Every structure is written in structure tokens, then in C-alpha cells.
Design a protein around this ligand. Sequence first.
Ligand SMILES: N[C@@H]1[C@@H](O)[C@H](O)[C@@H](CO)O[C@H]1c1nc(-c2ccc3ccccc3c2)c[nH]1
Ligand SMILES: N[C@@H]1[C@@H](O)[C@H](O)[C@@H](CO)O[C@H]1c1nc(-c2ccc3ccccc3c2)c[nH]1
Ligand SMILES: N[C@@H]1[C@@H](O)[C@H](O)[C@@H](CO)O[C@H]1c1nc(-c2ccc3ccccc3c2)c[nH]1
Ligand SMILES: N[C@@H]1[C@@H](O)[C@H](O)[C@@H](CO)O[C@H]1c1nc(-c2ccc3ccccc3c2)c[nH]1
Ligand SMILES: *Cc1c(COP(=O)(O)O)cnc(C)c1O
Ligand SMILES: *Cc1c(COP(=O)(O)O)cnc(C)c1O
Lengths: 810, 810
Amino acid sequence: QISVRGLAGVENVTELKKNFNRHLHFTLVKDRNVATPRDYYFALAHTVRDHLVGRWIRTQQHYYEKDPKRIYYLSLEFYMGRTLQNTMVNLALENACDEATYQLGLDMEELEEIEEDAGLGNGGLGRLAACFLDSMATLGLAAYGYGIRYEFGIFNQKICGGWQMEEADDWLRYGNPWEKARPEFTLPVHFYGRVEHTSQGAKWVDTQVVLAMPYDTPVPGYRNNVVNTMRLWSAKAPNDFNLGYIQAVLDRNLAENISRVLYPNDNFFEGKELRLKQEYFVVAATLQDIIRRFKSSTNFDAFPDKVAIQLNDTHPSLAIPELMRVLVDLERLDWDKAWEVTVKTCAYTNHTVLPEALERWPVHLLETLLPRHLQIIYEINQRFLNRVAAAFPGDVDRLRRMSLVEEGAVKRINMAHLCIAGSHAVNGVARIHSEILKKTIFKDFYELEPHKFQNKTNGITPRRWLVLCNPGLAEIIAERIGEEYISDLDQLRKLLSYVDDEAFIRDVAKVKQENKLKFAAYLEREYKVHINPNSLFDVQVKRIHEYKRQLLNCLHVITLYNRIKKEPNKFVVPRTVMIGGKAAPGYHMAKMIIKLITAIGDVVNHDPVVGDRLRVIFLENYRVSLAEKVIPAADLSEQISTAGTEASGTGNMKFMLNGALTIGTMDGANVEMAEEAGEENFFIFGMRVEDVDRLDQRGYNAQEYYDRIPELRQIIEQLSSGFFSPKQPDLFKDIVNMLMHHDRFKVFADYEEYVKCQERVSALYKNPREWTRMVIRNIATSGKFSSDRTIAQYAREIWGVEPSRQRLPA
Amino acid sequence: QISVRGLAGVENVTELKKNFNRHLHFTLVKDRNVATPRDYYFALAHTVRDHLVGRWIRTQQHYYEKDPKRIYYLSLEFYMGRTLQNTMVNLALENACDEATYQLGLDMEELEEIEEDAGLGNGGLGRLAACFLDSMATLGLAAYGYGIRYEFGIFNQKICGGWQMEEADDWLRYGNPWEKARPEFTLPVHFYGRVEHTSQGAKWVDTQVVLAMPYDTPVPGYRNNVVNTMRLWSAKAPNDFNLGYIQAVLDRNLAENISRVLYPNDNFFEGKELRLKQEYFVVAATLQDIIRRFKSSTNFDAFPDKVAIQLNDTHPSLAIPELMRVLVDLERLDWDKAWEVTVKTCAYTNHTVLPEALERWPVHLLETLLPRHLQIIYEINQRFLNRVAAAFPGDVDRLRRMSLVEEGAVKRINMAHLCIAGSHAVNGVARIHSEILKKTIFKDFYELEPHKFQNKTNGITPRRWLVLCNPGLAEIIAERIGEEYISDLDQLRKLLSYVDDEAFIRDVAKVKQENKLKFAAYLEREYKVHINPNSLFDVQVKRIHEYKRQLLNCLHVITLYNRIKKEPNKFVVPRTVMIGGKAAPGYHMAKMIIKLITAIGDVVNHDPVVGDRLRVIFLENYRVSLAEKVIPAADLSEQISTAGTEASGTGNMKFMLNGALTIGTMDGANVEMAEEAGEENFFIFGMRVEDVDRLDQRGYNAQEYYDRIPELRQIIEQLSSGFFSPKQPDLFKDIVNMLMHHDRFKVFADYEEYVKCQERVSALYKNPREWTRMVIRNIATSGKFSSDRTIAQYAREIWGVEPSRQRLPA
Ligand SMILES: N[C@@H]1[C@@H](O)[C@H](O)[C@@H](CO)O[C@H]1c1nc(-c2ccc3ccccc3c2)c[nH]1
Ligand SMILES: N[C@@H]1[C@@H](O)[C@H](O)[C@@H](CO)O[C@H]1c1nc(-c2ccc3ccccc3c2)c[nH]1
Ligand SMILES: N[C@@H]1[C@@H](O)[C@H](O)[C@@H](CO)O[C@H]1c1nc(-c2ccc3ccccc3c2)c[nH]1
Ligand SMILES: N[C@@H]1[C@@H](O)[C@H](O)[C@@H](CO)O[C@H]1c1nc(-c2ccc3ccccc3c2)c[nH]1
Ligand SMILES: *Cc1c(COP(=O)(O)O)cnc(C)c1O
Ligand SMILES: *Cc1c(COP(=O)(O)O)cnc(C)c1O
């Protein structure tokens, strides 16, 4: 049908049809009289998976023979989403599979909808890891992703009476056709025990053992025949575990709980023993695997020439002391040599400055669970602080600030400090964030070791986030500039020569309109909700958080409602305001925000004076598969975090690529997006980081804004008096109290500029030609935000390897 | 190589080789450079499984179209063993697969050894269910086996310091290629709650729900292209289960523990809540499946014409009140009609008379777990006792004895009484056992309803227990009488015409000798133990139990040892005494018996005066796969339970078929074996049932035997004084105390006759020609003990269906 989806040759289609019927019969044990759509999805998934196998085997053989430097990307989260379509795109099979299924009387798009998201992450951090795997494979790097195979991923969100309810995400119920269990490469992981000091070093003894069983998932590159591996560990009890009899067998669950469930907190640290077990589990199994693979090529001097370990935040930080443990206690290297190897091997990416998101583990937990690791951490600390004292003699406060060990009623280990000490490179994830790291929280470390600190601005893969989710847009671009941009996104700059081309303007607007109609129909079918597809689609999708300021969006929505009610016969640009995202189950204020959004909807959506001029929809169960539907449909992207709080953002980039304009603060990567597109093509508002600092120095007083802005005062009086909760008038008093007295994120301070900026958006939307021209200028300059660019920078500036666009033989 | 293993046609072999390589590549994702023997086993298993698929689909289609009466065999245990070889035998693929693997450079026998036993049973009862499935498929019956898919089957036994240690049987670790998950046919099962009485009947409300997810395993018939289904249920929590958040997800284990582990007690009742949950789980899921399938053909009058439910002992007895619950509470039938349907549908097989093995559930457990079922049981009881009172007016003691409810400090439900009341047929499992049921424990029930009581003597499948495990014997028989005996075992009678044939005599003895050499080599390789393969192989393999009298065997072994030490230069027929079997983990005396056996071995096997004239070996981890190796190698089968205690036995039959002679009491099926072979061709000894009763009436005094038999007194003095435990002289005092003062099984009473009978065995073994002639007379008359015979009797006399030997089209 469309060119970017590849060729549908007669031979190919015939072979796909025969293999589909083979899998239906032999693999699924069904005939066509009793097969359901789910059976047809599985038969297609098996058919496509068969095409990965030869390439996967050949890729791994090639790495064994060439012995390149291996890159190990360690993460507690990989937010993969669905695999079927991505696999077809990367192998150029989409049109052939479409034709083959069409000839069998099946709609492939319907089959695709049956697949479960692999939801093994919370949001941006996990999704970044997934985009990175795609880019590493596309760039020909010998890269492995290592994590945990959680039995339950991020919970499914249901909304009942306007409140979030959580349900277990039983994503493996029907099986996962994309993983291959490798029980033969099972490895032991140790916990508890005690340390004995002998004549020949320390020995960690009397430990409890849990087995780590790997499951491997293929990661195909874009049309290069490279297939890399994501290896996820699952916890198994040994067979003599606890071995009256029945109870001992049932108690195997205590060991196997390690891999049961993903902790569901985005950008928030909860110091629970089970989480620490998860972190050590992934690190200990992974490092044995790395060392095994290295020895199958005595001399650990070459280790950093053959291995890079990238730490995705501090969550796998125990890799540093574990590597030291293995090298010193088991391989018998002297400390200094082991440390040199460790530092040259490890690199740390920081993804946040919010203090509540930083990992600080109580010493008593480490003492009980990982006694040898605590000893090694103390030794690292003493040697590190000796260097600090020599560089800054007499600066006793600096010694306190830089210590890996934090004093207090409860002593804690600061894992970020451990990662900086033990890594040759430390990076932030957008320019402003990397600058903040050097000026504020890691200033002391930067002064000691300036060379370590880098920036690597985040990116997104244009395979999933353009070609897969928005084929109409991909195609109209391809008609003008060819297909090379899909793995060289900077070529989108060529689109600036079409900004005055009437046909291109029309086609861009047509694709957006089609995406909007398709999304409006999805809403009616799956959720019984009717929306005006001529309205401006104003979208804020991301995890629910005070710092992301969904509440600021709420204040604007109420402002618009109140203006309509005041002058009902005045024209206003119609909007559909969509907000979606999950709240962490224990985050009370985030749950109250969701309830407020639905409560605003209940009033606005049923007021006959408003009509279809304003609709407020809470998008339930926001996840990767829903992002793929809503982002191509959006007109306006809301990226409105308080300046200095969003390290990067990546949703922002997804919207830019897909033909939405952005309303945003100068925060995270929004700064760089505005620089690439031109500030004139971006709706910038609000305090900059410097303005926030100036307010903090004199003291934020929310009452001042309330006293000076009548429209704001009206909204607060409506919230307080029960206008949005008539049956429970005090329902929102915690929200009001927070905004008035302890708002860390200064919602009122950006209100006036936000409302004014939103009026400029509405003014531009009235002129569809100029709106669309601005869109073209955004899409055209989005190339910097490819994760291919990001990964090439990691490769050259951190890992010391060269990317390659060359194809392996098919 | 050998004819009974089928044809190895060039086309067939070529296709097997290509499909093997296809599975190695696409299914296992290995190439031949990194493949292990386990990978090669899996590639072969997938290759063979492919041949089952078309037949499985076509068989189930055929039952849908013809709509025959369906037979549902409900059991808590199915002791299947390995599947690969059995599948090849039943599809006539063994020689082709042998050739195909040989041409790939692989030894198929080595690959077969990699497969795990499916050990989902304890012993005889579970293995009987497995033989029955094989026979039902071979006889063309529309039969389904229903049970529980335990994650952990019967424990693996290790012997450490002569003591049994248990290890979890993690049989699913590497995957099970023979099951197909059917998550689409998942059904809810209810627990706890309470009963509300409304205008329109009782309602069971406020229940906890557990999901039952079926896994289907194919059951191929012998060369008839029939493939039946074994459906095993696995427990899953619903997704809103318990839905802080993390703990709620982890607590899903409470629901899923239902299918975690097989209770490891053979012929012993333990009244634990988890076991009751297991029993209800299997029954509730199964009955919904049965009713669904019946409705897809209002009128439950035809239910018993389309459905038979066979209860494998009382373990699935809750099927009776569950069927009543569904018909009365959900379908709204009147009680009397529902009861008529239930009785005509259900039949009960009793497998034991030992009082400790009978299920008697405390009322308080049923009250809490299954409140509606308890109400229905009380109503059944009241109506049943009303019939008793009308038939036997004034017989108040009979009312007490026959009640389903037992009075006491703790009220209990007698499940056997429930099964008799609710079934149209009740059978025992050997003639003597069925007679005992009518004269003793069910006498009252027999007097009320004589027509219900039947006998169905047990059997074994000659596919697994001759063709599979002893191909050499199968072949020499086939050379004389053809291949038809494999599904018509009565044809073995034709072998009586070869009892004087010198060539046949030689060939029978040669096969035994080859089996003995092969087993002696297995022992050296896997266990570092050397045995004389010219010695008489004296074998007792079965679960360890006081009633089975491994202790009587021990007394004979010590007797032989003491006789040798007394007259060391006298000739004795050399023996290797092998004893094997698992003890239930909580059964202290059974564990002490194992320790005694190994302790006897430690003395006997290292006494240089004994030499290789006597060896005592404890066979570790006795299971179905080990039975297949040791039984073909045995000369003497020990079947020495106290008369009246072994309901049938089936090991006895396996040994008869494989060319061992039997030393045994007149107990269970031994009686019928002796009748078929002639008493002159059997080594019968000991008390008959009547002699045991006469001893019980005057009182068993073990001291009398001790005082009168010097050889027995010497053994007891050796046990007591520490001769077999020099480091711990009192180690065996519990055994001595039991034998002298509270032996329920009268070991001393059969000692003298047992020793004398063993001397007759040794005398016959000295004359190999006459030994072998007696063997031929046993093999020749073993035909009655085919499970095909047993199943044809169930079919005609209980289920009302006709067996068929006709082939479905291939
Ligand atoms: N049998 C298991 C199932 O237990 C399950 O659905 C899953 C492993 O948990 O994958 C299945 C399985 N998958 C493969 C397989 C074969 C080829 C592959 C190629 C690419 C990616 C995955 C593959 C998995 C073999 N077995
Ligand atoms: N908020 C940033 C985004 O601004 C950023 O775009 C994204 C990818 O760099 O990483 C997100 C991020 N996520 C976390 C995060 C995720 C899970 C956690 C679990 C436990 C403790 C801390 C966690 C922090 C830290 N930073
Ligand atoms: N993928 C699962 C794995 O999760 C696992 O090894 C097992 C189900 O638990 O069987 C695998 C599986 N087996 C089949 C399959 C196909 C044809 C069959 C024919 C006969 C018997 C079993 C069959 C199983 C499909 N999937
Ligand atoms: N001992 C007999 C054998 O003599 C007989 O050959 C076999 C098959 O009929 O059934 C055995 C049998 N096994 C049980 C048994 C098995 C498991 C149990 C689990 C819980 C409670 C009672 C149980 C009884 C009862 N009877
Ligand atoms: C991209 C993405 C995120 C990150 O969005 P931000 O706006 O950067 O927080 C979160 N969740 C999902 C499902 C995503 O696809
Ligand atoms: C046949 C068999 C049994 C039953 O043997 P009995 O001697 O009848 O108790 C027990 N276990 C296994 C593994 C079997 O094959």
C-alpha cells in the first residue's frame, strides 16, 4: 500500500501464508473452525519470529569471531511495549505480512491490537532504555541490555468513580513468543551470610543462594540484519531450598519473589529490602555473565578494552563494589589494579535532581544483606576521601559533603556519590540538566575531577515513534526526500525547502486530520466517549507528578470554562483537553490530581452552555501502545514542568516528530528543542531556572498571586467551596492547602504567563495555513532528537567504539 | 533393527532428519556447534510431537461429530513417567527415529535418558491412572483424564549417610514439550463465602475466586491414530486479587499454592486444608468443563447417557455434592431428579482397606471452606438414612454405622460412604479385595444395595511394560506368534506350545541375561556400585510401608548372612538383593526401614568371607523410569504384604510380564496371578486372610515366635545390641520394639514359611532350564493382567460403552 512499509513480492507472500498455516496447525494446535483472533495473532507472531532466528544466530556468531568491545547496558527497567509491528518494520516485512494476512481473510491491524505491552518500566527512564537498544542495534554495536524479567509489570490503571484503581499486569498469561528461556545458563546469586578474614583474603560465607535464570529477547536493527540480545533474569529457588516438607516447598516463593513485580514509583525512591534484593540480583548475575564471556576469548588489564558497563542511574550501582569483590576476593588482584579496571569499565548516567528520587540506602540493610559489599564501600570511601583531603587540604566541610557515607540518626550510603567515584564518565541527559549537575548537586565532584562530567542529550527512536506509529506522515516525507531519513534523522532539515509548498502544507494537515479522526473513533469504540475532531487536541500525557504540573493545566482548563460561562455567546477556538498518566499507588497527592481532572470533566462535559467548545477527557491506562495512538493525533504538546525539575523529558520529542506544536517552560530538553526549531516556532512561557532561584531566595508566597489575580482567586474559591464536588464539598481541601501554603513547584507563579501563552496558541490555530507552516518548521528540525544521535555520542565519547551503518549478510 | 519397533523407510527418515534440523534452528535457536545433548533431546521431542498434532485435532473433531458417550476419569494423581519413547511406540516411529538420529551422529537411547519423569503420583494408584489412559485410547473410547498440574511432583530421593533426604522435583524447569496451555478455557473456582436462602433457592455468596487454567497433554492409542486428552488444571489468581500494592501482588501466591505440590503420602490420609482445596479445585473446574461440553451438542435426563464420571478413590468425591449443587442451585432441577442424574453418572473405585488411608474430613473444615457442599452432604445423609430405616426398621446401630457423618469429639464426613450413596457402581481392584469390601468394611451397604458392588481386577499396559522397557523379550515373542499380542495380550497363551522348545528356552534366558548385564552396567556408571550379573536378582521395589513388609525381606537377608558366617565354605546360590522405594517424608518408621536396609548393606557388602555370594543394594530414587530398567532385569519378584492388606498391587504384574518368578503371599492380585499360572509355578507362602483373622481373635504375641525360633532370636539380638550400628548401638530400638510389641502386620508370623520358601527358590535357580520353563509358564499366562482387559470390563459393565479396535484414518 505505502512505500516505507516495503515490498510485497509474490514469493514472499506465498511463503508467509504457508508458514502462518503451519504455525496455526503445529504450534497452536487449532484449525480455522475454532481459531480466535488471539490464535491468529500468535500464528503471525511465530511466523515473523522465524525471520529473526537466522540473523540472531549469525549476529552472535559474528561477535564471537570478530571479538569487538562489548557494551552492557544495565537497567532495572526496559519499557518495550509491543514487538510485532516493530519487528516487521525493522525487517521490511510489514507490506508482505499485510498482504499475506489480507489474502487469508484477516485484518493485520486488528491482530496487532491483541498483543500485550511489555510494560517493564514506569515511564521515561525505562522507555529511554528501550529506544537505546533499538539505536544500538541499528548502529551495529555489540550491545546487550540486562535487566529483570518481572512477572508483573507496571499496573493496569482503571478509573472507578473518577479514582485510580490498580490491577496486576499479568502480561505473561497467554505466553510471550518473543523470549527464549535459557535455563542452561542459570547462575547463582548470594545473599546474607557473613565475612571471614583468612590468611589469603576475605571470604563471604554462609550465604543464601537464589538462582538467576536468563530469558533472551531479540533486538533487531533497522534493515541491517543485526539482531542484538536483551537478557532478563528471573529468580528461581534451588531444589534443596529449605530442605515440614509441604511448607518447605511452598516457601520457595520467598526466593522467587525477587523477580515478581516492578516497583511502580516514577522518580521517587522507596528504600525497601525487596528493591535492594532486585538491584543486587540483576548486578550479580549480569557481572558473572560478563566475566564468563570475557574469559572465553588471567589478564584483566584488557578488561576495559573489551567491556563497557553503562549504569542507568544508580539503580545498578552495586556493579561497582561487585566488580571489586570479584576482582579482589575471587581473582586475587591487588586493590589498586582492580580499582583502575573498575573505573575504566564503568560509566554512570544521572537522570534526576529531585532529592526524593536519589537512592540513599540505610547502612543496616546493606550490613545484613550484603556485608562484604558494605566493607568494600567503606574502603572505597576512605581512599576517595584521602584524595579529596590531598586536593583541598583543611576543607573539612567538603569531606563531609563528598562522603559516600551520610551521617544522621540513620547512616546511609549515597549511591550517586559511589557511582561518581567509581566511573570514568558521568553524564546528564540534557544540556541544562548536565549544567545543573556541575553547578549544584555534584559541584564538589566536578571541582575534583572536571574531566569526568559530560552531557548526552536524550533522544527517541524514529522507527517506533514515526514510522511505526505515524505511517501517513512517514510516507509524505519519504515522497519528497526518500527513505534515508529513517536512520539519519538530520535529513529532515531538507523539509525546510517545502515550507511554502502548497501541496506539502495540504498533505501535512491532511495526515494530522486523518490521525485525529482515527483517534476520535478509537475513543468512541473502546470508551463510549464522543469528541469533536475539528477541535484543537491539547494533550498532556506523562506520569502524574506535582513537578510535571498537571495542576497548572487544570487551572487553565477551569479558566477557559469560567470565561465561557461569563461570555457564552463569544467565539472561542474549540478544544479537547486530554490528560493521561499513572499515579504511583502510594502517592496520595497524585491520586487526588487524577480525581480533580475527572471531576472537572464531570462539570465541563455536561454543561449545555459550553456545548462542544470544551471537552476534558482523562485518558485511562496511559502506556506505550496508547502513546503510539494519541501522539500522532495531538495538536498541542503540554511540557510544563517547573524550570529545573524535568531532567530531560522524552515525550516532548515524540510530539515534535509527529506534528504537534509545544507549549512549554525552558526546562530539560525543551531548551534544545526551542533552539533547534527557533524560539519563534515554540510557545515558551514562564520562569527560567534563574527566576525560580530568585523567588526561592526571597521566599515563595502563593497568597500574593491569589490576592493580585481575580481569575485565580475565583478558581480557588470554586475548589474550596465544593463547586467540582457538590456531594463532598471539602474533597479538594488538600489540593487547595498545598497550592496556598507548601507548593514546591510554584504553580501560581507561572499561571498568568501560561494563560496568556495559551491565548497565542488559540490565535495561531485559527489560521490553519500558518499553524501548519510552524509545524513543518518543528518536524524539519527534530533530527537532533533521534536516539541514533545520542547513541553515537555515547559510543564515541564514553565507550570508545565506532558506530557502523553497514549491513551483515542476510 | 528389531521388527516390533516398525519400519524405517527412506522417505520417513529423510523427513524426520529435516524436521529435527528445522526444530534445532527455529524452535531451539541453536546451531550444531553449541548444541548440547539436552538441545538434541528437545529437537527430537518436537519432531515426534508434530506427528501427534493432526491425529489429535482429527480425534477431537470426530468426537464432536459422532457425539459418543464421554468417559471422565477424575484423579488427583497421574504417574505418567517419560513420554518420548511411548509416543514413538504408539505411532510406529521408533525404528525411523533411531535411524534418523543415527545418521545425524546421535544415540537416541542417550537422548531418551535426558527426559524428566512426569511424577505426578505417589505409586500404584497414580500409575494405574496412567495405564488406564493408555488403554482407553487404545480401545477407541472417548475418554478424558482430569487432574492437577502440580508444579512439584513426587520428591527426588537422595540417600545421605544411609538416610532418605528429599529434594523438590522441579520437573518443569527446562519446559514440558508435551503440554499445550489453553488459557482461553480458564474457569473460576469458588471458596469460603456463606449461604443465603432466598425465595428461589440457596445462593453461595461472598466467595474468594481462584482461576483454573487447563494444560492439555495428548494420549496416543496403540497404532490406531486415536489421540485422547489429559487435561490438568493449574491455579491462577485473578488480576484484581487483593486489589499496600507490592504486598497484594506478592500475596497472589496464597491462591496459586493450590497447584504447587503433590502430597507425598502413599496409602495414608492427612486431613490438611490445602489438600481439601486441591480436591475441590479439580472437581469444580472439571465439572464446569463437562457441563459446557454436554450443552454444546435444558434436558439433563440425557446427561447420564452422554457422561460417565469415574472417581479414582474418594479423592474427587466432592464431584457428587458439586454435581448436585450445580443441578439444584444453578440449573433449578428438583432434588429427586438431580439425584437420579448424579447417581447414574457417577461410579466409585475403592483402592484400599487400611483405615489410616480412608478420607474422613472434619466438619469444621468443610463448614468454613465449602459451606453449601456441607449442607448438601447433610441432606444426602438424611435421605439416605431414611432409606436404611425403611429397609431395616429398628436397627439403630446400622443407622450409626452407615451414616455419612461420624460422631466423636470431632465430627467427620466419611467420604467412602458418600461415594457409595452417590454412585451406581462401586468396585474393588482385585477379586479378594472386592470380596473383603462386601464382607467387612462395606457389608452394611452391600446388604442394602447388592447390585452396586463389582470387581474390576487391575492391569498394566503392555505397551510401556513390555514393548517399551523390554524390546528383546517383545521381539522373541513376536518371532513366534506375531505382533497382535501387543493389543490382545491373551494371545501370550500361545507360548505354552514352546515350553519344551529348546531354541525358545535359550532365547528367553538370553534376553534376561542381556537385561541383567545392561542393568549391572547402569549401576556402575550412575552409582559406582559393582554387582555379579550371574547372581539371582532378588528385587523388592515399591513404596516403603510397614504393610508391604520390606522388614520381612530384611530378616531373610540377615538370615542368609548369618548362615554364610556359620558355614562359610558351603555353597550357596549367589544373590543380589535389591530393595528400593520412597518413604513419605513424615513417616518415621518407613525412614528407619530405609536406614536399616543401608546399614545391612554396609555390613554384608564389605565382609570378605561373604565375597560376591550376597550383596544388598538400596536402589535410590525409585520412580517409573527406574522401574523400566530394573523390572526387565529381575529374576525374583518380592510381593510379600500381609494377607488382606495390599488391595491389588500392580508391580507384581509388571514383573510377571517381564520374566521374573514371584515369591508372594495370597494377597491382592497375587491370588489371581497364581490361579492363572498354576500354583505349582508360583512361590506361595504364609498366612492366608483366614489365618490372619484366626491370629487376631486369639491375639498376636510376637514373643512366642522369638522364643521358638533360634535364628529369629539371633537376628533380634543383633539389631538390639548394635551389630548393624556400632557407633549408635540403640539406633534400631524403635524397630525392635515395634516388631516385639505392636506389629500390626505380623512379620514374625510369616518368617519361618518365608525362609523355607526362599530355599525352594534357590534350589530351582540351580537348574536354569527348569527355572526358564517356569518363567515361560508365567509369561504365557500373564494376559489377564493387561489394562486393556480391565478397561473393556469398566466400559461394558460400568460405563455402558463398547470398546473398538478400529483405526481412525491417518
Ligand atoms: N516455549 C516457550 C514458552 O514457555 C513461552 O511462551 C516463552 C518462554 O517463556 O517462549 C516459548 C518458546 N519460545 C521459543 C522461541 C523460539 C524462537 C525464538 C526466536 C526469537 C525470539 C524468541 C524465540 C523463542 C522456544 N520456546
Ligand atoms: N524524570 C526523568 C526524565 O526527565 C527523563 O527524560 C528520563 C530519561 O532520562 O528519566 C526520568 C527519570 N526517571 C527516574 C526514576 C525512575 C524510576 C525510579 C525508581 C526508583 C527510584 C528512583 C527512580 C527514578 C529518574 N529520572
Ligand atoms: N510454549 C510452551 C511453553 O511455555 C512450555 O514448554 C509448554 C507449556 O507450558 O509448552 C510450550 C508449547 N507447546 C506447544 C505445543 C504445540 C504442539 C503440541 C502438540 C502435542 C502436545 C503438546 C504440544 C504443545 C505450544 N507451546
Ligand atoms: N495400595 C493400593 C494398591 O494395592 C493398588 O494396586 C493401587 C491401584 O489400585 O492403589 C494403591 C492405593 N493407593 C492409595 C492411596 C494413594 C494416595 C493417597 C493420598 C491421600 C490419601 C489416601 C491415598 C491413598 C490407596 N490405594
Ligand atoms: C515517552 C513516554 C514517557 C515519558 O514522557 P515524559 O513526558 O518525558 O515524562 C512516559 N510514559 C510512556 C508510556 C512513554 O511512551
Ligand atoms: C507399578 C509401580 C508402583 C506400584 O508397585 P506395587 O508393588 O504394586 O506397590 C509404584 N511405583 C512405581 C514407580 C511403579 O511403576
